[PDB]
Design a protein around this ligand. Structure first.
Ligand code: HEM
Ligand SMILES: CSc1ccc2c(c1)N(CC[C@H]1CCCCN1C)c1ccccc1S2
Ligand SMILES: CSc1ccc2c(c1)N(CC[C@H]1CCCCN1C)c1ccccc1S2
Ligand SMILES: [Zn+2]
Ligand SMILES: [Zn+2]
Ligand SMILES: [Zn+2]
Length: 467
């Protein structure tokens, strides 16, 4: 068939000069309007095809799901100890090493969500610690980003290591700092050359520079995992994900085919921290910003909280089914926030057809999730913060098919259930105890995000006064 249309590639630079990596989302919307829902791009050495709109995204990730579940190879991961049997989950090539870990994480999260419901208890407890930290600001204006990062990070810590860290723990803070620096190493021209020409990794200066923060991150992680290994009681059922992994590691001793080994454990835990911290934290940061920019919505949320939960009792997941408006608001925060505009890249493992065009095997697929969440043909006013995008005239919560912030198909966010829990419990707990507002004498913060691959709220401060 015909290959997707797009800007004519430059002789050597290809379409690199046709893409603004500072505002890639805006740039891609421009290309979409010009070339259609499915367009091509030759970014450096990689042939790329961008998918816009729900139809294109689903046809690729769902209809042709078996052929689009792979990730583009990333040579530099060798630096982090990657191997055929240890690829973590996030960037693991489609195959058994990924599927065994995918199934393990999914079932493990599900299990920690049943019975005594450990996950919900850890989250509820963290929300209380978070509220107390907000109160310590005594009404003084502050940037809530740091605390949101710590609260969300502690939830992953609870899930993986069965513990939390005090907000002033040296090790915890170093870990968070390394995490934010590490995210940056996902961009840059250096990584682009090294991945295209892996032999350049033989030069110490370069190999030791591309992922210095991510390597240090893993090193800090090793220290924590080693301590956990000492406290693990194998005679009791696994209390957290690392214990379940260790138990599986023991059963796999002697099996060279297993993905349960020391090299993979550190990668899997690092992946959960990496994929689950900045996302959930940035979403909550958008949440509070939108609440001070739209006080009316905030009051309506607080009125539903008071009517369903009261001002004493801690919010519970059971309350969610009875708070359609708060659910609508949280969903609109994600839709409007659009924190992962271009999702995570996929790679075709077989020629496929999308919207009639031919997609050669080995093509890197970019899912423009932003084009789905902001589609003008689906949403009433995609560019406004409008809770009613998820409510009907009767006030019932309705979730359009276009709500795909976690993507779709076999590789769709495995943390979605936990993210939903964290967003509801952290948001409601905070709105239940505080009234948030923009600090006087300060300009109304912008609703425009700052793109750095991940889309964050423009820097802002706020006052949290007890209710
Ligand atoms: C508001 C929160 C979150 C958002 C918007 C988000 C979004 C996403 C997106 C867009 C992807 C890529 C899907 C694809 O490849 O097509 C992804 C993957 C993934 N997410 Fe999340 N995420 C969130 C939180 C979480 C959390 C809390 C965890 C961890 C417990 C996590 C775990 C992962 C993992 C491990 C993957 C890779 C799955 C695979 O390759 O099979 N995420 N997420
Ligand atoms: C703490 S550095 C950090 C922070 C946030 C993110 C990521 C890394 N990762 C990759 C996870 C990586 C962690 C080290 C072990 C190997 N695995 C692959 C990422 C990659 C591409 C899009 C989004 C993201 S979210
Ligand atoms: C892995 S998740 C992911 C998802 C979408 C984009 C990116 C990464 N990348 C660069 C990695 C890749 C993109 C295709 C061309 C070959 N290179 C290696 C990026 C970085 C900064 C601004 C925009 C983008 S688009
Ligand atoms: Zn434990
Ligand atoms: Zn209805
Ligand atoms: Zn209170």
């Amino acid at each position: 068939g015909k290959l997707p249309p797009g800007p004519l590639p430059l002789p050597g630079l290809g379409n690199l000069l046709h893409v603004d990596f500072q505002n890639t989302p805006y740039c891609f919307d421009q290309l979409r309007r010009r070339f259609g829902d499915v367009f091509s791009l030759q970014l450096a050495w990689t042939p790329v095809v961008v998918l816009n709109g729900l139809a294109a995204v689903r046809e690729a990730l769902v209809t042709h799901g078996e052929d689009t579940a792979d990730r583009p190879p990333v040579p530099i991961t060798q630096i982090l100890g990657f191997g055929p049997r240890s690829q973590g989950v996030f960037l693991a090539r489609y195959g058994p090493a990924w599927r065994e870990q995918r199934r393990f994480s999914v079932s493990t999260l599900r299990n920690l969500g049943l019975g005594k419901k450990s996950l919900e208890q850890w989250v509820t407890e963290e929300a209380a610690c978070l509220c107390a930290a907000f109160a310590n600001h005594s009404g003084r204006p502050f940037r809530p980003n740091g605390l949101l990062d710590k609260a969300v990070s502690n939830v992953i810590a609870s899930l993986t290591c069965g513990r939390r860290f005090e907000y002033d723990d040296p090790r915890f803070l170093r870990l968070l700092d390394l995490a934010q620096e590490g995210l940056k190493e996902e961009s840059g021209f250096l990584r682009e050359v090294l991945n295209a020409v892996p032999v350049l990794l033989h030069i110490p200066a370069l190999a030791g520079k591309v992922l210095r923060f991510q390597k240090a991150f893993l090193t800090q992680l090793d220290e924590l995992l080693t301590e956990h290994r000492m406290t693990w009681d194998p005679a009791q059922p696994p209390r957290d994900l690392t214990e379940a992994f260790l138990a599986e590691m023991e059963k796999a001793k002697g099996n060279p085919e297993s993905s349960f080994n020391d090299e993979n454990l550190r990668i899997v835990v690092a992946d959960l921290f990496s994929a689950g911290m900045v996302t959930t934290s940035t979403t909550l940061a958008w949440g509070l910003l939108l609440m001070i920019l739209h006080p009316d919505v905030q009051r309506r949320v607080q009125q539903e909280i008071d009517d369903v939960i009261g001002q004493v009792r801690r919010p519970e997941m059971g309350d969610q089914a009875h708070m359609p408006y708060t659910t609508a608001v949280i969903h609109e925060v994600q839709r409007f926030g659009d924190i992962v505009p271009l999702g995570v890249t996929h790679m075709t493992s077989r020629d496929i057809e999308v919207q009639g065009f031919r997609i050669p095997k080995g093509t890197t697929l970019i899912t423009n999730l932003s084009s789905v969440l902001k589609d003008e043909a689906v949403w009433e006013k995609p560019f406004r913060f409008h809770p009613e995008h998820f409510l009907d005239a009767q006030g019932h919560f309705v979730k359009p098919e276009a709500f795909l912030p976690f993507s779709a198909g076999r590789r769709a966010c495995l943390g979605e259930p936990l993210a939903r829990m964290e967003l509801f419990l952290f948001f409601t707990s905070l709105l239940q105890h505080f009234s948030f507002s923009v600090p006087t004498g300060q300009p109304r913060p912008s609703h425009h995000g700052v793109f750095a691959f991940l889309v964050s709220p423009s820097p802002y401060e706020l006052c949290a006064v007890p209710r």
